Design a protein around this ligand. Structure first.
Ligand SMILES: Nc1ccn([C@@H]2O[C@H](COP(=O)(O)O)[C@@H](O)[C@H]2O)c(=O)n1
Ligand SMILES: Nc1ccn([C@@H]2O[C@H](COP(=O)(O)O)[C@@H](O)[C@H]2O)c(=O)n1
Lengths: 353, 353
């Protein structure tokens, strides 16, 4: 059912001709495109964009994103003739590779100036070989920068991690005093209601906004909150002690309403959901121990004093009271504007000539 | 953190030389490996095995499967030199490509006799070009065989879909009368308990074994069952009317214990979990209407009279009643032996000379 686009990877479309002189951006898949999007948004204002991708999963997604590019084509197969026909048709001014995508024939056989963004060093031979073929490399940490320097890469800088850029959107305002728990799993729901109950003994006017990972469980979450003794309501309606959200697509807009956020996927062995969203609004986030799928992000937030790992119900209780009595300052957003700015300026300067 | 093995894909390992004359099996990733495992098991006994894979995700998994191969190497990069260095070093006797993996430099530049297994026709140009470069093609349906015939492929047969091969394991035994509900999600538990309750009015000895998609939900599932008025217990202990399973890894062993299986991910919009497993015990399986991720399997089971879709609680009751009152003969297992035998013999035939 998926389009693999083999013929096109092997023998790129004659129609790339119409995209001559574009800025070439390569985003392996959906993750890379989303990581890069706050940069593409700005470059799109100053360049025609030729957008390529490697994963066949990304084609459909990327079709919905035609506002952010002029041409769309799968990465050419990694053979000198396929890579060279692509280049020869499209006459690109530069190629920005998001994250890594060490394709040897791509890198070795194209003449186009090449830029690497958001890279980390792994210390492997292939890095020793390909790193130097980039005209500009922008890395996540100064540590990674040192390693590539010892590879004889000229023009390697550090701008921080692109994945820490805030994409806040509009934000919702509600009268009241709220904790927001987002992306909560069935196995997590008990610990959070037992803690909130413990909390409410002290903060009587405090309302919990409970947003399940899967909205098909809202009714079961509500009933659970009844059995624990809470007044409950479904969002719009703020009358409950526990307000349930049964609509997808609202959670990130909803965070700014809380003094504290809790992000699920974390008290059960899921590996964690998006810890960044609440902190972008200057609000601290608590999560359980299972953050192995968002590790870089978890470590980032701890360094920033914005993220707090709790092991159980007692610790969650403890941590909530601490944060309710002393308002924690969070400067994630400003770090975000700094990461964005660092990337944009290096890229604009490089592309200037 | 994953190894992409770029350098090896570009310049395959000298030590492939110690694998001279092996049967080369290519499994893109985990899915393909598992699909082919029942043929590999048998071919392993007559041949040295050189196993390649494309996804970096597959490496770790396949390292645990060293019983099934002699050499393990990532698929060479798709350039004539990388493909040929691989071939030259390893001197394979044949290459069996599982499923599709239409890699053109792979297909065009190697001399090794090539076999394609479990293929289907998509009717596309790359298929017209590459399909004839295979010395033997074994497809899912006679329809697919047809299409490739008109592409001038010689040696094209239909053996069925390898994904319908049963891999049953041991099979647990319990005193009692059971329905087994497997990989049930939170948003599905209510309709299953409601239907089972309506069923228990007539069949008072029936016990329901409830196996959540996720372990951590067992306690919430148990409480839910109590709210419905059932005695409950946790597995080992068969005393409840509803018996929870809070350990992973036994669902597939448990199925034969029941007269009917219900498989979840199908009543909520998940797209379905493994419908095949119970039918391999000769036991009919019921599922809800969301089977879009498991659609070929769904259609197969319907054709076989082994799988029944139900829209809601009322239909689940009706269908459970039908199957409880009149025992349904299921011949999936027998079909499975036929698919496995058709593939195995064609392959052994072609490999003999
Ligand atoms: N019930 C839910 C659950 C998640 N979400 C959102 O969907 C996205 C989920 O992404 P993550 O997997 O990165 O956590 C986030 O934007 C989160 O805010 C939502 O809007 N409603
Ligand atoms: N509680 C659970 C849930 C699933 N399982 C198993 O894990 C595998 C899940 O695969 P599927 O996604 O295809 O359903 C199946 O073999 C199923 O038997 C289990 O053993 N215990």
């Amino acid at each position: 059912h998926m389009q693999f686009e083999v013929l096109k990877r092997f023998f790129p479309k004659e129609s790339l001709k119409n995209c001559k002189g574009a800025l070439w951006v390569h985003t392996a898949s959906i993750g890379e495109f989303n990581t890069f999007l706050p940069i593409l948004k700005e470059l799109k204002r100053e360049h025609r964009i030729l957008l390529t991708y490697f994963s066949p999963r990304a084609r459909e997604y990327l079709k919905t994103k035609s506002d952010f590019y002029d041409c769309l084509h799968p990465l050419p197969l990694d053979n000198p003739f396929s890579v060279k026909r692509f280049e020869e048709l499209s006459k690109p001014k530069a190629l920005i590779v998001v994250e890594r995508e060490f394709w040897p024939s791509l890198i070795i056989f194209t003449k186009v100036p090449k830029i690497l963004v958001n890279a980390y060093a792994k210390g492997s031979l292939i890095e020793k070989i390909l790193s130097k073929k980039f005209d500009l490399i922008i890395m996540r940490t100064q540590e990674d920068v040192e390693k590539f320097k010892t590879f004889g890469a000229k023009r390697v800088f550090s701008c921080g991690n692109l994945k820490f850029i805030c994409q806040k959107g509009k934000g919702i305002k509600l009268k009241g005093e709220f904790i927001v728990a987002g992306s909560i799993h069935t196995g997590e729901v008990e610990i959070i209601l037992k803690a909130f109950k413990e909390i409410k003994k002290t903060y009587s006017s405090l309302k919990l906004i409970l947003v399940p990972r899967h909205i098909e469980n809202a009714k079961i979450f509500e009933k659970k909150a009844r059995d624990f003794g809470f007044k409950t309501s479904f969002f719009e309606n703020l009358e409950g002690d526990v307000i349930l959200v049964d609509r997808f697509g609202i959670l990130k807009e909803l965070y700014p309403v809380g003094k504290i956020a809790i992000v699920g996927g974390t008290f059960v062995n899921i590996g964690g959901h998006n810890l960044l969203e609440p902190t972008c609004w200057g609000i601290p986030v608590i999560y359980g121990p299972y953050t192995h799928k968002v590790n870089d992000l978890k470590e980032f937030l701890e360094k920033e004093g914005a993220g707090f790992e709790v092991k159980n119900e007692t610790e969650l209780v403890t941590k909530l009271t601490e944060l309710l009595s002393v308002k924690k300052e969070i400067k994630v957003e400003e770090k975000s504007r700094e990461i964005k700015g660092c990337y944009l300026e290096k890229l604009r300067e490089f592309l200037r000539g």
